[model samples]
Target chain A: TFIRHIALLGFEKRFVPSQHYVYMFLVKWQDLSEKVVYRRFTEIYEFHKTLKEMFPIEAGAINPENRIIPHLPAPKWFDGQRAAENRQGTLTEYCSTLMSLPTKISRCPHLLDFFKVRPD
Target chain B: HMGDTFIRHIALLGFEKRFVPSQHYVYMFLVKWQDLSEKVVYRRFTEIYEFHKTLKEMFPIEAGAINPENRIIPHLPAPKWFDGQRAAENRQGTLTEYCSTLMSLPTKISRCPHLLDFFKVRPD
Candidate 1:
């Protein structure tokens, strides 16, 4: 069981600490049990953007038809309560596509870092 | 009916290398607007890259991200490491084409805030 695989289980809105949304993730390590991480849209997006820049070819930045990376829901147009919910739905669906993608696009430092739990 | 915000055209004249960090370049341009006024601007590859990223994020629909069906955002090649002067020299054609495509696209994208602000003249 080579470590590192993840799931974007879902997301939740926070009110106790104030207004915001946090993406929920599940990390299953090499028979090492599972871990949970909550991240904001920007963090995930930064990784995606950074990853895209790091490998523009893979990101399909050169040509849309040649891309291997899955499209991510943008951070904008989510201010509406219902619209935000709709975007979350798109992101949740985008997760399966991301995980189901091929190995070459899967195993990368960016993916590993995104799945890593950071100190809150 | 006149929106001076409308950009009429863009021309990538060439490039200039900066000596400060000991290398790299800034492509020079001349922007002509509907107002018939023209402004000379200089930009870096990194700045253009950043602007494009933000532009895509801002208009994922037009950018062909989530709903990438028929929508098409013009593509710009990534900077590959090469002799700095040579690299900048080579990109002129493609970069010019990129600007050409931008000025040709629909207003929702071509005339968007991201595009306009990126090309806005700064104090020299």
Candidate 2:
């Protein structure tokens, strides 16, 4: 069990000109090793799916039970259509939610594998 | 309104989506102001390139050497599979490298008044 502490540093909007995909930077750190990467909301969802599959008991269901405290936040547009304050607020909460997860759950190989590589 | 006080540290925070598909890349930049928090704004590549163009046009003496044609914008080598879609798919990396070079101009030519104003306020 290689326990690595993960921390979300900041977020930024990135555009893949060819694919026309808009991605958000999930700037993060694993212990002292800093990794800055971009991930779409879809990618994060897939990660959530993987976690639930591995630890259904610990990850918990999305609703009814209310066992899950820090689920993924609502997706926000990178365009300034949304208020900057609201965008910032949601980002802070989302970052906090991820950071607040128990080290045992977060350090799980399923989750740790996602943060191991730097996204292009 | 344009003076030494207006100029400060600036960073190019990558780009946003396509305002005009197949036409321009909308880029975001940041300004580290003294009295206020960092100011963030977005501008299209064409607009910023024009700023670069206009600087050389208006002040050839100062901005002559900094022209885009004279500079070498970093471009990534094409991917292994070179086809229409392959070329198109790998195009994003190219634009990113190109925009980075264009945005870093202000730091080099900050001495020019016209160029300074170009970055001081958001592009119209």
Best by lDDT: 1
The C-alpha stretches of model 1 lying farther than 4 A from their native spots are A1-120, B1-3, B81-85
DockQ of every candidate: 0.02, 0.02
Task: Tell how far residue A30 is off in model 2, in angstroms.
Answer: 5.9
TM-score for all predictions? Answer: 0.47, 0.36
All candidates: interface RMSD: 17.6, 13.0
Report fnat for all candidates as fractions from 0 to 1.
0.00, 0.00
Candidate 1 lDDT over A1-120, as tens digits, reads 332444444456677468777766656565546776777777777877887897888788899888877787677856665654455555555654565566565656667667777866
Residue pair clashes in candidate 2: none
Give the number of the best model, judged by TM-score.
1
Tell me the RMSD of model 1 versus the true structure.
Answer: 18.5
